[PDB]
Amino acid sequence: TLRAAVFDLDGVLALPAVFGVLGRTEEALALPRGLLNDAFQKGGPEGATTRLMKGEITLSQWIPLMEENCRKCSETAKVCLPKNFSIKEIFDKAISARKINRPMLQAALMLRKKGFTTAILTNTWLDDRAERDGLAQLMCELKMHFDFLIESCQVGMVKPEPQIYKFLLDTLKASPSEVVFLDDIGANLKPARDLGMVTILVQDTDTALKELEKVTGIQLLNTPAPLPTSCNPSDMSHGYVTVKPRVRLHFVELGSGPAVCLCHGFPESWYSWRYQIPALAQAGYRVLAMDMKGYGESSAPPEIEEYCMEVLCKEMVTFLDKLGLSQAVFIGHDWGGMLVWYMALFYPERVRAVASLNTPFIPANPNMSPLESIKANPVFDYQLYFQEPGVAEAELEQNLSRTFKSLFRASDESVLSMHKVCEAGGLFVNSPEEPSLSRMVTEEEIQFYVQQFKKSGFRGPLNWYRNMERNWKWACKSLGRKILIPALMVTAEKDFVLVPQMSQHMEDWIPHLKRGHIEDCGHWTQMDKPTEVNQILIKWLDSDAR
Amino acid sequence: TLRAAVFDLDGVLALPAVFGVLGRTEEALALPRGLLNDAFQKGGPEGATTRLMKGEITLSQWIPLMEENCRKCSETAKVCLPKNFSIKEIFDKAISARKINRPMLQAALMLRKKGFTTAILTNTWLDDRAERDGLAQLMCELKMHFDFLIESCQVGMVKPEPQIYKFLLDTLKASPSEVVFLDDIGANLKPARDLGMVTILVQDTDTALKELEKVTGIQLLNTPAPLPTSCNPSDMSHGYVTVKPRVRLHFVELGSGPAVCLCHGFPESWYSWRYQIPALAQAGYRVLAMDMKGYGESSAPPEIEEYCMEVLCKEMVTFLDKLGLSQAVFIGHDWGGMLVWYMALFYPERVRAVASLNTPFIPANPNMSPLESIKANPVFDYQLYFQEPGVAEAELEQNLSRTFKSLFRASDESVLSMHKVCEAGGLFVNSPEEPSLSRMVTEEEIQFYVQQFKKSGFRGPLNWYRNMERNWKWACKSLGRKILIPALMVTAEKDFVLVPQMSQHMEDWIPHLKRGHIEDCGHWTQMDKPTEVNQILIKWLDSDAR
Ligand SMILES: O=C1CN(Cc2ccccc2)c2ccccc2N1
Ligand SMILES: O=C1CN(Cc2ccccc2)c2ccccc2N1
Ligand SMILES: [Mg+2]
Ligand SMILES: [Mg+2]
């Protein structure tokens, strides 16, 4: 029956309410109780505050009217305002004190996710204050989670007037009884209740959610921890840079602040960072999530040497040159992780800081060809399989859905061993035709990867493994250097290929290395443990990259 | 005969040379003359400094070797180093003191422009210092102007070794006598001279340029002021954002720092900002140059109301939402200028600051339909011509090269009046079939616009003029507000349509308005007077947007 949920902002999605601050200021300053609220409401429908809420005037224009209203209320109550009495001040402090009320947002999310239409309905203002950006950020964070945000000052109408409710019902394409509306102000619910909307008077958050649960019949309170925000591909800004004539790089870009360049592994995609992108943007970074060379919408030339580490690094440098970035933070996973260490080693001036998921830094052995070194560790055998052009391509392209569903699995869901892959004659020889869906991924997400890899297949991606000798020789030029820029190594407990112990000597070459460690985390770190990855990255960025 | 020019960096393209600082430090600190230079050169080809210049070790690793070398030189000269003696300190100060030597760069540019291949050949290091970004910026600014930058630490070879010269000749695809090489160090010229290169020992900049001029036969010294750096379309990062299902916006993106969104007028393109984009990036801004709705690679739906100012503004807001920008600076010219004022009026929270070229802010008259207001000013008659769907499209599309060559003219080159356009029956009725090329634009630049407008023609662009009544009604909601965010109005003396006097009352509605004024500047402000536009914008950004 209920098909939509509408949330007030002040006192419902954002806390403390600002009327909250009018009460406290009065008391703090020992004024007559409600004086500030009387000055605020003065003139009712024709007073300064309604003009503000309707968008007739801006917040900077209203500030001095509210002042006058405060003088008038104080003369009529026969008191004096203190020296230094400042409406601008009180409101600045009140607006910056209000934060997102997380459990209300998470209930709104859950309702959206079971197919509700959701909106925010708020009496708010055109904010031209010096400090306006703080509230602009808050509104951006909330708004991306709802179908509509309706602001009194944008539509020229205010709660409790009945026209904003008709405007509400009409934007929702729903009828009065299909709608629940939560607000902390009883007067605002009245007209909704009159048209026959379910309404909830919001005092403490928990009781409201209990009423919302009872009325919608969906579980909202005490729900398990939700995933971080993911990305919809078609809502992202997509960027394209030609680094040389045959070769363009594609990337998805979100956020502002220091540039952070995310470099995925094999066989992945910018989308492998879907859970990191909004979190790092929200944390104040400019995220740039690559399709690396060979993948997705980046170019995929056929030749093997287009994919040696030297060329790949030079082209990441060109990518920065053409974007006009003197530096970025480089964060890599798997093959991308190897590449970011080599960026730190060959272009420290271009790298603000470097971090790797799973891939350790282990200096080349100048007395052992890497092809030989690889034979000494049974879990790397899959790399030998990858050598012969064509063999891995045929298997991996043969059925794309099967390929990614077989690969993208949590550590207890595995369907293949990386073990005697050559002997067995394939990565999938003893795995199902139709694997079950890992808990880590939805069917839709698998089909994103399938559609990406339909553009170029596995030749470019596999070529990353086809330059052993060439990479070894390049790496050897670097054996006298150390990595002395800010660096983070994140190991994953249950990565049975890129095992945490392989990283054990990294402090020899990177003396100031910082670490995180994720327990119960397989090879696909970002989607296995997105919440922990986000927390470890954001903390290290804020302390070392800022 | 000469086909290439090679410039050293330290002491040639960048000044003061850092050997410069070794001399001064010695004297400042009353040490034995040359002690610091001896410590620096110690061990010659096998000493610490060569390892550094070859890329074997990083700058942070070399610092303490140089220290040791300074202790050793001082004991052998029988003196003591002062308390607080700091190699890191001296070098930090020396590196940040060096700036681009502008007249050498401009000579290099001119030589490139007459078809020389140009390169930088430098002994330099892998720079992992905390403060590395300063030099990274300097190298980015220089490098974008040359065919090659060859660094000793990237190629594993050093001047004066003869292999870097062979590596040089081979990268240039030229022979010894086709090459001029400028360096401030005589030893470096020797091997070039041995292979038969022209060389120039660089002491004072002017004498070197006089030698370079004499030898190349091109005028380099006392040349007129050059244009700002322009943009090559295919070297830019191109971004695409879907703001709603039928509609994507394209933009070119360069630089990092506060987002600055450039909004061109009619009938233009992101490319109309070609001279501003590198300058604002170089000044520390993140430039976003739009194709506005209806143009270039942005969507161009056919319906008129898709182009009213309300819709256009809402979609610029969505563009910010999807890019994750809580604000941008909005700078507009012509129609883009009108739009940025309306962004300031309806979304101040999203606008960090607002500036307009040519387009004034004049509040709507609520007692006169704008269609009528327009009839009262003969220079706006071209807007009436634009009203009837199809009529202007047929004329403007009929011959694209003629259209833009007729429009894009400096103030003394005009070939049409905006005067009785309806009566005459066309914008071009009394103008040439094949106009001559304005001094403002090359043939290639005209053909960029021609190819852009081949994608969608003039329907979307002309529709910006087709919502008078709708825009008037929207604007009237704003008649109580003022613009109180930071704002800049730049008038152009010889814009005979958007005349400077039309802006005269703007302080009534924008009390803190700042101004610039450009003399001898027609309607096409950015390409008419790019140098002055850049200076006025960069100065106002640095003081009000930062
Ligand atoms: O394909 C490869 C390339 N190499 C050497 C290399 C050296 C330096 C940089 C990139 C690659 C490698 C080294 C270790 C494990 C696996 C591999 N697999
Ligand atoms: O096409 C137009 C639209 N209007 C009104 C308008 C009002 C507000 C915002 C955009 C447009 C206009 C006003 C003045 C000069 C020329 C024009 N030409
Ligand atoms: Mg409220
Ligand atoms: Mg020099």
CA distance A70 to B189: 80
B453 Cβ below 6 A of ligand 2: no
∠ CA A172-A176-A181, nearest 5°, is 75
B413's tokens = 């080159």
What spacing in Å lies between the alpha carbon of A254 and ligand 2's midpoint?
A: 34
Among A54, A73, A96, identify where a domain stops. Answer: A96
B contact test, residue of A58, A322, A327, A351 with most B CBs within 10 A: A58
- The answer to the question of residue B506 being in a domain is yes
Among A81, A96, A111, identify where a domain stops. Answer: A96
Note whether B280 and B287 are within 8 A (CB): yes
Give the distance from residue A244's alpha carbon to the nearest chain B alpha carbon, in angstroms: 9
Alpha carbon A508 to its chain's center: 34
Give the distance from residue A49's alpha carbon to the nearest chain B alpha carbon, in angstroms: 14
**Residue numbers of A annotated as active site:** 334, 465, 523
Give the distance from residue A309's alpha carbon to the nearest chain B alpha carbon, in angstroms: 14
From B51, B326, B481, residue closest to A140, measured CB to CB: B326
A294's tokens = 């060979």
Residues 483-522 of chain A with CB under 8 A from chain B are 483-485
Strand partners, B516: B490
Radius of gyration of chain B (CA): 29
CA distance B320 to B158: 48
Chain B residues with CB under 8 Å of A145 CB are none
Residue B123 assigned ligand-binding role: yes
B383 Cβ below 6 A of ligand 2: yes
Among B51, B76, B96, identify where a domain stops. Answer: B96
Sequence-ordered alpha helix ranges (H) in A159-204:
162-172, 186-195
Q: Check whether residue B345 and residue B321 sit in a common domain.
A: yes
CA distance B289 to B297: 12
Instruction: Report the amino acid identity of residue A79.
Output: V
Choose which residue among A472, A477, A506 to substitute to test ligand 1 binding: the one with the highest number of ligand atoms within 8 A of its C-beta: A472
Q: Check whether residue B66 and residue B165 sit in a common domain.
A: no
Q: Check whether residue B54 and residue B189 sit in a common domain.
A: no
Nearest-atom number in ligand 1 for the CA of A380 is 16
Residues in chain B: 546
Chain B residues with CB under 8 Å of A132 CB are 348-349, 485
- The answer to the question of residue A224 being in a domain is no
Strands (E), B282-380: 286-291, 328-333, 351-357
- The answer to the question of residue B425 being in a domain is yes
Note whether B525 and B518 are within 8 A (CB): yes
Note whether A269 and A461 are within 8 A (CB): no
Give the distance from residue B341's alpha carbon to the nearest chain A alpha carbon, in angstroms: 13
Instruction: Return the closest-CA partner of residue B52 out of B90, B83, B91.
Output: B91
CA distance A251 to B390: 39
From A58, A234, A235, residue closest to B481, measured CB to CB: A58
CA distance A284 to A307: 33
Reduced to 3 states (helix: H, G, I; strand: E, B; else coil), residue A248 is strand
Residue B8 assigned ligand-binding role: yes
CA distance A306 to A312: 7
How far is residue B42 from each of residues A152, A442, B54, B185, B534, measured CA to CA in Å? 74, 63, 15, 18, 47
Q: Give A388's contacts (C-beta < 8 A, 6+ positions apart).
A: none
Phi, psi of B514, rounded to the nearest 5 degrees:
-105, 155
Instruction: Return the closest-CA partner of residue A452 out of A252, A271, A240.
Output: A271
Residue A69 assigned ligand-binding role: no
Q: List, as ranges, residues with CB under 5 A of the ion ligand 4.
A: B 8, 10-11, 184
Give the distance from residue B249's alpha carbon to the nearest chain A alpha carbon, in angstroms: 10
Annotate B25-37 with b (16+ C-beta within 10 A) or e (fewer): bbeeeebeeebbe
CA distance A326 to A259: 10
- The answer to the question of residue B229 being in a domain is no
- For B112, what's the count of Cα atoms within 13 Å in the CB-facing half-sphere? 17
Strands (E), B229-320: 237-244, 247-254, 259-263, 286-291
Q: Check whether residue B206 and residue B268 sit in a common domain.
A: no
Q: Check whether residue B152 and residue B80 sit in a common domain.
A: no
Chain A residues with CB under 8 Å of B241 CB are 237-238
From B237, B259, B287, residue closest to A241, measured CB to CB: B237
| CATH number of the domain where residue B479 is located | 3.40.50.1820
CA-closest residue to ligand 2 atom 4 = B468
B380's tokens = 């706006």
Q: Check whether residue B203 and residue B264 sit in a common domain.
A: no
Q: Check whether residue B146 and residue B295 sit in a common domain.
A: no
Is A544 an 8 Å CB contact of chain B?
A: no
Pocket lining for ligand 1, CB < 6 angstroms: A 309, 338, 342, 364, 370, 383, 465, 468, 471-472, 475
Residues 144-173 of chain A with CB under 8 A from chain B are 144, 154, 156
Nearest-atom number in ligand 2 for the CA of B341 is 9
Give the distance from residue B399's alpha carbon to the nearest chain A alpha carbon, in angstroms: 31
CA distance A523 to A532: 14
B18's tokens = 């850092």
Strands (E), A152-235: 179-183, 198-201
- The answer to the question of residue A149 being in a domain is yes
B212 Cβ below 6 A of ligand 2: no
Sequential DSSP letters for B409-441: --TTS----SSSHHHHTSSSTTS-SSPPPPTT-
Phi, psi of A199, rounded to the nearest 5 degrees:
-140, 155
Note whether B272 and A359 are within 8 A (CB): no
Instruction: Return the closest-CA partner of residue B145 out of B124, B165, B126, B117.
Output: B117
Cβ pair B60:A484 closer than 8 A:
yes
Q: Check whether residue B408 and residue B514 sit in a common domain.
A: yes
Instruction: Return the closest-CA partner of residue A229 out of A278, A285, A282.
Output: A278
Neighbours of B160 (CB within 10 A): 16
| CATH number of the domain where residue A48 is located | 1.10.150.240
Reduced to 3 states (helix: H, G, I; strand: E, B; else coil), residue B155 is helix
Say what the resolution is, in angstroms: 2.2
B370 Cβ below 6 A of ligand 2: yes
Reduced to 3 states (helix: H, G, I; strand: E, B; else coil), residue B102 is helix
Neighbours of B450 (CB within 10 A): 16
Question: β-strand A99-100 against A14-15: which pairing, if any?
Answer: antiparallel
Strand partners, B311: none
CA distance B431 to B91: 63
What spacing in Å lies between the alpha carbon of B341 and ligand 2's midpoint?
A: 12
∠ CA B546-A318-B237, nearest 5°, is 60
- The answer to the question of residue A458 being in a domain is yes
Chain A residues with CB under 8 Å of B287 CB are 324
Is B60 an 8 Å CB contact of chain A?
A: yes
Chain B residues with CB under 8 Å of A61 CB are 480-482, 484
Report how many domains make up chain B.
3
CA distance A534 to A277: 9
Chain B residues with CB under 8 Å of A352 CB are 133
Q: Check whether residue A166 and residue A182 sit in a common domain.
A: yes
Note down the domain range covering B386: 236-546
Is A326 an 8 Å CB contact of chain B?
A: yes
Q: Give A195's contacts (C-beta < 8 A, 6+ positions apart).
A: A165, A169, A176
Residue A84 assigned ligand-binding role: no
CA-closest residue to ligand 1 atom 6 = A471
Proximal ligand: closest to the CA of B345: 2
Reduced to 3 states (helix: H, G, I; strand: E, B; else coil), residue A47 is coil
Q: Give B279's contacts (C-beta < 8 A, 6+ positions apart).
A: B228, B229, B534, B538
Neighbours of A50 (CB within 10 A): 18
Sign of CA dihedral B108, B113, B116, B118: positive
Q: Check whether residue B3 and residue B71 sit in a common domain.
A: no
B314's tokens = 């809402």
Chain A residues with CB under 8 Å of B477 CB are 55-56, 156
- The answer to the question of residue A229 being in a domain is no
B471 Cβ below 6 A of ligand 2: yes
Nearest-atom number in ligand 1 for the CA of A309 is 10
| CATH number of the domain where residue B109 is located | 3.40.50.1000
CA distance A209 to A111: 11
Instruction: Report the amino acid identity of residue A453.
Output: F
Note whether A475 and A482 are within 8 A (CB): no
Residues 344-373 of chain B with CB under 8 A from chain A are 346, 348-350, 352
CA distance B441 to B419: 25
Element (H, E) at B373: helix B370-375
Q: Check whether residue A213 and residue A77 sit in a common domain.
A: no
Residue B291 assigned ligand-binding role: no
CA distance A244 to B540: 36
Q: Check whether residue A186 and residue A280 sit in a common domain.
A: no
Residues 249-268 of chain A with CB under 8 A from chain B are 253-256, 258-259
* Burial bucket for residue B166 (CB in 10 Å: 0-12, 13-18, 19+): middle
How far is residue A132 from each of residues A129, A154, A257, measured CA to CA in Å? 5, 16, 18
Nearest-atom number in ligand 1 for the CA of A362 is 14
- The answer to the question of residue A167 being in a domain is yes
Is A397 an 8 Å CB contact of chain B?
A: no
